Short mmCIF file of C-alpha atoms and ligand atoms in Angstrom, two decimals:
data_model
loop_
_atom_site.label_atom_id
_atom_site.label_comp_id
_atom_site.label_asym_id
_atom_site.label_seq_id
_atom_site.Cartn_x
_atom_site.Cartn_y
_atom_site.Cartn_z
CA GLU A 1 31.26 22.31 -3.43
CA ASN A 2 31.42 24.45 -0.19
CA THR A 3 35.17 25.42 0.20
CA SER A 4 36.67 28.67 1.75
CA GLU A 5 37.98 29.46 -1.79
CA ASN A 6 34.47 29.14 -3.43
CA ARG A 7 33.14 31.22 -0.63
CA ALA A 8 35.70 33.94 -1.24
CA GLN A 9 34.68 33.94 -4.87
CA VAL A 10 30.95 34.18 -4.13
CA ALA A 11 31.64 37.10 -1.63
CA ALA A 12 33.78 39.00 -4.18
CA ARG A 13 31.11 38.67 -6.83
CA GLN A 14 28.38 39.82 -4.43
CA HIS A 15 30.38 42.86 -3.29
CA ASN A 16 31.32 43.80 -6.96
CA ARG A 17 27.66 43.33 -8.01
CA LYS A 18 26.57 45.95 -5.40
CA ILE A 19 29.23 48.46 -6.79
CA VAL A 20 27.94 47.77 -10.41
CA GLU A 21 24.30 48.49 -9.13
CA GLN A 22 25.50 51.68 -7.41
CA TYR A 23 27.21 52.87 -10.59
CA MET A 24 24.19 52.34 -12.76
CA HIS A 25 21.91 54.19 -10.24
CA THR A 26 24.15 57.23 -9.70
CA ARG A 27 22.25 60.32 -10.93
CA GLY A 28 22.25 64.03 -10.54
CA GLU A 29 24.85 65.73 -8.28
CA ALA A 30 25.95 62.25 -7.07
CA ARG A 31 27.59 61.79 -10.48
CA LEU A 32 30.34 64.22 -9.24
CA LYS A 33 31.44 61.38 -6.82
CA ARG A 34 31.09 58.33 -9.09
CA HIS A 35 34.91 58.23 -9.50
CA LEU A 36 35.22 57.11 -5.81
CA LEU A 37 34.11 53.66 -7.03
CA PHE A 38 37.31 53.30 -8.97
CA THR A 39 40.86 52.27 -8.08
CA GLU A 40 43.29 55.22 -7.97
CA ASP A 41 44.53 54.28 -11.41
CA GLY A 42 41.14 53.17 -12.73
CA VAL A 43 40.13 53.84 -16.29
CA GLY A 44 36.73 54.60 -17.71
CA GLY A 45 35.14 56.01 -20.89
CA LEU A 46 33.53 55.60 -24.27
CA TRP A 47 34.81 52.81 -26.58
CA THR A 48 32.54 53.47 -29.48
CA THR A 49 33.24 56.92 -31.10
CA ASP A 50 33.08 58.41 -34.57
CA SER A 51 36.96 58.37 -34.84
CA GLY A 52 37.21 54.71 -34.06
CA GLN A 53 39.46 55.31 -31.07
CA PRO A 54 38.12 55.34 -27.41
CA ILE A 55 37.89 58.41 -25.20
CA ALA A 56 39.68 56.71 -22.29
CA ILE A 57 39.83 58.59 -18.98
CA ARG A 58 42.78 57.56 -16.83
CA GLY A 59 42.82 57.88 -13.15
CA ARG A 60 40.34 58.56 -10.40
CA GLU A 61 41.03 62.40 -10.46
CA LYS A 62 40.49 62.60 -14.24
CA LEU A 63 37.34 60.61 -13.93
CA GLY A 64 36.11 63.16 -11.48
CA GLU A 65 37.01 66.14 -13.90
CA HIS A 66 35.19 64.35 -16.68
CA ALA A 67 32.08 64.13 -14.45
CA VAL A 68 31.89 67.93 -14.20
CA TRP A 69 31.77 68.02 -18.10
CA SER A 70 29.29 65.14 -18.22
CA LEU A 71 26.83 66.70 -15.83
CA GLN A 72 26.99 69.97 -17.94
CA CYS A 73 26.46 68.18 -21.29
CA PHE A 74 24.00 65.50 -20.10
CA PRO A 75 22.36 67.35 -17.20
CA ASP A 76 19.35 64.98 -16.55
CA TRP A 77 20.66 61.62 -17.74
CA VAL A 78 19.22 58.47 -16.51
CA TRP A 79 20.05 54.77 -17.19
CA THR A 80 16.94 52.49 -17.41
CA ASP A 81 16.14 48.82 -18.36
CA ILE A 82 19.30 47.77 -16.52
CA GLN A 83 20.26 44.14 -16.89
CA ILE A 84 23.41 43.00 -14.98
CA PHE A 85 25.38 39.93 -16.13
CA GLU A 86 27.70 38.16 -13.75
CA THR A 87 30.38 36.12 -15.47
CA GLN A 88 32.60 33.18 -14.63
CA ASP A 89 35.15 35.78 -13.50
CA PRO A 90 34.06 37.31 -10.10
CA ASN A 91 35.88 40.46 -11.18
CA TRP A 92 34.21 40.95 -14.57
CA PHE A 93 30.54 42.08 -15.18
CA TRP A 94 28.56 43.25 -18.25
CA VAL A 95 25.50 45.48 -18.22
CA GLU A 96 22.99 45.99 -21.04
CA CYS A 97 20.74 49.15 -20.53
CA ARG A 98 19.13 52.06 -22.26
CA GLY A 99 19.86 55.76 -21.54
CA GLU A 100 18.01 58.98 -22.15
CA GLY A 101 18.25 62.71 -21.47
CA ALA A 102 19.02 66.09 -22.83
CA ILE A 103 22.10 66.58 -24.78
CA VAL A 104 23.68 70.09 -24.56
CA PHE A 105 26.91 70.08 -26.60
CA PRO A 106 28.35 73.44 -27.51
CA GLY A 107 28.06 74.20 -31.29
CA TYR A 108 24.91 72.14 -31.63
CA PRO A 109 21.40 72.88 -30.82
CA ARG A 110 20.00 71.44 -27.52
CA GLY A 111 18.57 67.86 -28.26
CA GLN A 112 17.07 64.78 -26.63
CA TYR A 113 19.29 61.78 -26.74
CA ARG A 114 18.41 58.11 -26.50
CA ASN A 115 20.77 55.25 -26.95
CA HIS A 116 21.28 51.49 -26.29
CA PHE A 117 24.47 50.71 -24.22
CA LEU A 118 26.68 47.82 -23.20
CA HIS A 119 29.02 48.51 -20.28
CA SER A 120 32.00 46.34 -19.22
CA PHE A 121 33.09 46.53 -15.49
CA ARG A 122 36.51 44.82 -14.35
CA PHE A 123 37.34 44.99 -10.65
CA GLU A 124 40.46 44.88 -8.57
CA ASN A 125 40.35 44.68 -4.69
CA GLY A 126 36.57 45.53 -4.77
CA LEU A 127 37.02 48.75 -6.83
CA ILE A 128 36.50 49.31 -10.54
CA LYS A 129 39.78 49.04 -12.47
CA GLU A 130 38.30 49.39 -15.94
CA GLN A 131 34.86 50.59 -17.12
CA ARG A 132 34.03 50.67 -20.92
CA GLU A 133 30.90 51.94 -22.64
CA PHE A 134 29.70 50.69 -26.02
CA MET A 135 26.85 52.42 -27.86
CA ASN A 136 25.68 53.24 -31.47
CA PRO A 137 27.29 56.70 -32.37
CA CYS A 138 24.74 57.22 -35.06
CA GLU A 139 22.05 57.75 -32.46
CA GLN A 140 24.14 60.47 -30.90
CA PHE A 141 24.56 62.02 -34.38
CA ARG A 142 20.69 62.09 -34.71
CA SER A 143 20.37 63.77 -31.24
CA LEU A 144 22.76 66.57 -32.38
CA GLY A 145 21.13 67.20 -35.81
CA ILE A 146 24.05 65.71 -37.59
CA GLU A 147 23.17 63.90 -40.77
CA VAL A 148 23.64 60.10 -40.50
CA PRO A 149 25.63 58.39 -43.31
CA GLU A 150 23.49 55.62 -44.96
CA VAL A 151 24.85 52.24 -46.26
CA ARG A 152 22.98 50.60 -49.17
CA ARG A 153 22.84 46.86 -48.85
CA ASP A 154 21.76 45.71 -52.33
CA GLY A 155 20.49 42.30 -52.60
CA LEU A 156 20.31 41.79 -48.85
CA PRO A 157 17.67 39.05 -48.56
CA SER A 158 14.32 39.99 -47.20
CA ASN B 1 25.67 18.46 -5.78
CA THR B 2 21.96 18.72 -6.52
CA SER B 3 20.31 17.40 -9.77
CA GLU B 4 18.92 20.84 -10.75
CA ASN B 5 22.33 22.60 -10.57
CA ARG B 6 23.76 19.45 -12.27
CA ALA B 7 21.17 20.08 -15.12
CA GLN B 8 22.30 23.61 -15.20
CA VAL B 9 26.09 23.02 -15.41
CA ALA B 10 25.29 20.51 -18.22
CA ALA B 11 23.18 22.95 -20.07
CA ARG B 12 25.74 25.77 -19.79
CA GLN B 13 28.47 23.38 -20.95
CA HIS B 14 26.53 22.31 -23.96
CA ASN B 15 25.58 25.84 -24.77
CA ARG B 16 29.16 27.06 -24.54
CA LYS B 17 30.23 24.46 -27.05
CA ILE B 18 27.57 25.87 -29.44
CA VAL B 19 28.91 29.42 -28.91
CA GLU B 20 32.50 28.24 -29.69
CA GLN B 21 31.30 26.47 -32.86
CA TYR B 22 29.50 29.58 -34.00
CA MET B 23 32.54 31.88 -33.36
CA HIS B 24 34.89 29.49 -35.13
CA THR B 25 32.78 28.96 -38.16
CA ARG B 26 34.58 30.33 -41.24
CA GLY B 27 34.55 29.85 -45.08
CA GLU B 28 32.00 27.63 -46.76
CA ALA B 29 30.98 26.34 -43.33
CA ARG B 30 29.31 29.60 -42.93
CA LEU B 31 26.53 28.30 -45.21
CA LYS B 32 25.41 25.87 -42.48
CA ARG B 33 25.79 28.15 -39.42
CA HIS B 34 21.96 28.47 -39.24
CA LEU B 35 21.72 24.84 -38.26
CA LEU B 36 22.80 26.08 -34.70
CA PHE B 37 19.54 27.95 -34.34
CA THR B 38 15.99 26.90 -33.21
CA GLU B 39 13.69 26.67 -36.16
CA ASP B 40 12.15 30.02 -35.20
CA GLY B 41 15.43 31.57 -34.00
CA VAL B 42 16.55 35.19 -34.70
CA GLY B 43 19.92 36.62 -35.71
CA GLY B 44 21.18 39.92 -36.89
CA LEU B 45 22.75 43.38 -36.41
CA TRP B 46 21.56 45.51 -33.49
CA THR B 47 23.77 48.60 -34.31
CA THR B 48 22.73 49.94 -37.65
CA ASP B 49 22.77 53.36 -39.32
CA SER B 50 18.89 53.41 -39.24
CA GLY B 51 18.90 52.91 -35.56
CA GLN B 52 16.65 49.81 -35.98
CA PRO B 53 18.01 46.25 -36.11
CA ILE B 54 18.41 44.17 -39.16
CA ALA B 55 16.90 41.00 -37.60
CA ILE B 56 16.71 37.78 -39.63
CA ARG B 57 13.91 35.52 -38.37
CA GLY B 58 13.90 31.75 -38.85
CA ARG B 59 16.41 29.11 -39.64
CA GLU B 60 15.67 29.18 -43.40
CA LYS B 61 16.02 33.00 -43.80
CA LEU B 62 19.15 32.79 -41.71
CA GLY B 63 20.61 30.27 -44.22
CA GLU B 64 19.55 32.59 -47.01
CA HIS B 65 21.20 35.54 -45.39
CA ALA B 66 24.47 33.47 -45.25
CA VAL B 67 24.65 33.24 -49.00
CA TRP B 68 24.65 36.97 -49.15
CA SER B 69 27.16 37.30 -46.38
CA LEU B 70 29.57 35.01 -47.93
CA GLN B 71 29.50 37.14 -51.23
CA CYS B 72 29.83 40.54 -49.35
CA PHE B 73 32.50 39.34 -46.74
CA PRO B 74 34.32 36.58 -48.53
CA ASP B 75 37.16 35.91 -46.10
CA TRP B 76 35.76 37.11 -42.78
CA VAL B 77 37.37 35.90 -39.52
CA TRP B 78 36.58 36.45 -35.91
CA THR B 79 39.65 36.78 -33.70
CA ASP B 80 40.52 37.64 -30.12
CA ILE B 81 37.48 35.83 -28.97
CA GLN B 82 36.44 36.06 -25.30
CA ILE B 83 33.48 34.07 -24.15
CA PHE B 84 31.41 35.19 -21.15
CA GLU B 85 29.22 32.72 -19.35
CA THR B 86 26.55 34.45 -17.14
CA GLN B 87 24.33 33.51 -14.29
CA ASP B 88 21.76 32.37 -16.81
CA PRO B 89 22.88 29.04 -18.35
CA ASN B 90 21.08 29.99 -21.52
CA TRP B 91 22.69 33.53 -21.85
CA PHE B 92 26.24 34.22 -23.06
CA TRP B 93 28.14 37.28 -24.30
CA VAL B 94 31.17 37.27 -26.51
CA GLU B 95 33.68 40.10 -27.03
CA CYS B 96 35.85 39.89 -30.19
CA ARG B 97 37.34 41.50 -33.21
CA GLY B 98 36.41 40.78 -36.85
CA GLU B 99 38.11 41.58 -40.14
CA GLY B 100 37.90 40.99 -43.83
CA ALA B 101 37.39 42.34 -47.22
CA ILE B 102 34.08 44.20 -47.76
CA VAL B 103 32.52 43.71 -51.23
CA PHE B 104 29.17 45.60 -51.42
CA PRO B 105 27.28 46.51 -54.64
CA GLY B 106 28.16 50.11 -55.63
CA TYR B 107 31.00 50.79 -53.09
CA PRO B 108 34.67 50.25 -53.76
CA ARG B 109 36.08 46.97 -52.36
CA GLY B 110 37.47 47.70 -48.90
CA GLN B 111 39.11 46.21 -45.91
CA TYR B 112 36.72 46.14 -42.89
CA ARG B 113 37.73 45.73 -39.28
CA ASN B 114 35.48 46.30 -36.24
CA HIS B 115 35.20 45.41 -32.54
CA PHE B 116 32.06 43.28 -31.69
CA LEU B 117 29.95 42.24 -28.77
CA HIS B 118 27.60 39.33 -29.43
CA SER B 119 24.69 38.20 -27.29
CA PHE B 120 23.59 34.53 -27.42
CA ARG B 121 20.36 33.30 -25.83
CA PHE B 122 19.50 29.57 -25.97
CA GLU B 123 16.40 27.29 -25.93
CA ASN B 124 16.55 23.54 -25.97
CA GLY B 125 20.35 23.57 -26.64
CA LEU B 126 20.12 25.75 -29.76
CA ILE B 127 20.38 29.48 -30.32
CA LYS B 128 17.07 31.32 -30.04
CA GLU B 129 18.38 34.86 -30.35
CA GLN B 130 21.80 36.09 -31.56
CA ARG B 131 22.45 39.91 -31.62
CA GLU B 132 25.58 41.62 -32.79
CA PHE B 133 26.69 45.11 -31.63
CA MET B 134 29.47 47.02 -33.37
CA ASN B 135 30.50 50.56 -34.28
CA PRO B 136 28.83 51.40 -37.64
CA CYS B 137 31.32 54.20 -38.23
CA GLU B 138 34.12 51.65 -38.86
CA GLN B 139 31.89 50.05 -41.64
CA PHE B 140 31.31 53.51 -43.15
CA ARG B 141 35.10 53.99 -43.31
CA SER B 142 35.60 50.57 -44.98
CA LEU B 143 33.17 51.59 -47.75
CA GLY B 144 34.69 55.12 -48.35
CA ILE B 145 31.66 56.76 -46.75
CA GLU B 146 32.43 60.10 -45.06
CA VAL B 147 32.02 59.96 -41.22
CA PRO B 148 31.09 63.24 -39.44
CA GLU B 149 33.12 64.30 -36.44
CA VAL B 150 31.33 65.14 -33.09
CA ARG B 151 32.96 68.23 -31.47
CA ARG B 152 33.00 68.00 -27.62
CA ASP B 153 34.10 71.52 -26.57
CA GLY B 154 35.58 71.58 -23.09
CA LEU B 155 36.15 67.84 -22.79
CA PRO B 156 38.90 67.52 -20.23
CA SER B 157 42.19 65.78 -20.90
N1 LIG C 1 29.08 58.35 -20.41
C1 LIG C 1 27.64 58.57 -20.30
C2 LIG C 1 27.28 59.72 -19.34
C3 LIG C 1 27.67 59.20 -17.93
O1 LIG C 1 26.97 59.58 -17.01
O2 LIG C 1 28.69 58.35 -17.89
C4 LIG C 1 26.15 60.42 -19.44
C5 LIG C 1 25.45 60.43 -20.67
C6 LIG C 1 25.88 59.79 -21.71
C7 LIG C 1 27.19 59.11 -21.69
O3 LIG C 1 27.05 57.98 -22.60
N1 LIG C 2 27.36 39.48 -39.42
C1 LIG C 2 28.82 39.49 -39.72
C2 LIG C 2 29.07 38.47 -40.78
C3 LIG C 2 28.89 37.07 -40.07
O1 LIG C 2 29.63 36.10 -40.25
O2 LIG C 2 27.88 37.00 -39.36
C4 LIG C 2 30.30 38.59 -41.43
C5 LIG C 2 30.89 39.77 -41.43
C6 LIG C 2 30.48 40.97 -40.96
C7 LIG C 2 29.19 40.88 -40.22
O3 LIG C 2 29.42 41.62 -39.00
#
C-alpha cells in the first residue's frame, strides 16, 4: 500500500543503501574520510578477534584516527564480490564480501591477506551509527605467518 | 496489491517460519532438523581453522551429521536470536549466540560459547543452503587449545 509512511521508509532505505555502497567502494586516500559517513558518536570496528572481544572504535574522530593506521597496515586493500542485503528494518543492512591486499603489521613479515567478511550497518538520521565487521581470524594468522591452531574432529561423518 | 508480490510475501512468510523452526530446534528434535532441507540441500560451517568450509551435502548426510553433533554438543542452545528478512524472499540472515558443553574425542570436556551469523537460502519452501559463520578462536579456547595473540603496534585508542 502507497502511504506517506511507506514512502518515508522506502526513501530512508534507498538513502542508506547508497551510503553502504559508498562505504564498500571507498579505497586509497579516500579511506581517510570514511568516518564522515558516521554519526558523531558512531561506532565501527572488528567483532571477530583472537581475544574474543571486539576492537570497537567509538566516535567519528577516533574512526578517522584509526583510518591513518589502517591505510599504513593495509595499504592497497580492496573489497570485492560485494553483496548488499536490505532488511525489514530500513536502518539495518548486512553485506557479504571478500577482501584482499597486502598486510604490513610491525613485528611480522609483509604478507598478502585474503578473507571473507560479513559487515553489519545500522543507521540513524541517514548516517551510520554502528558498523561491525566479522571475519575468520585464522586467515589473518596465515597472512602473518602465525601457526594456525588445528581442531581434530574425530568421527565426524564423511 | 499484485499477485506476484502477493506470491512473494507468502513465500517470505513461509520461509521465515522454517528459519524460526530451525533456530528453535533443540535436544532430540535435532535428529530431524535435516527434514527442513531440500533433498540435495547443503549445510555446514563456513569459518574453520583450515580456511575451507565443512559443508555437508544432502538431506541424508545432514541427518547423519546430526547424530555426531548431538554427541559432541549434547545440550546446545541458540539464544538472542535476531532474524533478518532481505529483499530476496528466499534469503535470510540470523545473528545469534550459542552455548553448551563441548565433548570432542581427545580434548577435555569444555563449555563452548560463540557468536554466530547464519545464512539461509531457500528453494521450493525448504532450505537449499545453510552456512554458519563464527569465531574459531572461541572453539579453540573451549577445548584448551592455545590461541596466538596478533600484535597490532600503533593501533590507536
Ligand atoms: N577493517 C578492514 C580495513 C578497512 O579498510 O576497514 C582494511 C583491511 C582490513 C580490515 O578488515
Ligand atoms: N553447527 C552447530 C551445532 C548445530 O546445532 O548445528 C551445534 C553446536 C555447535 C555448532 O555450531
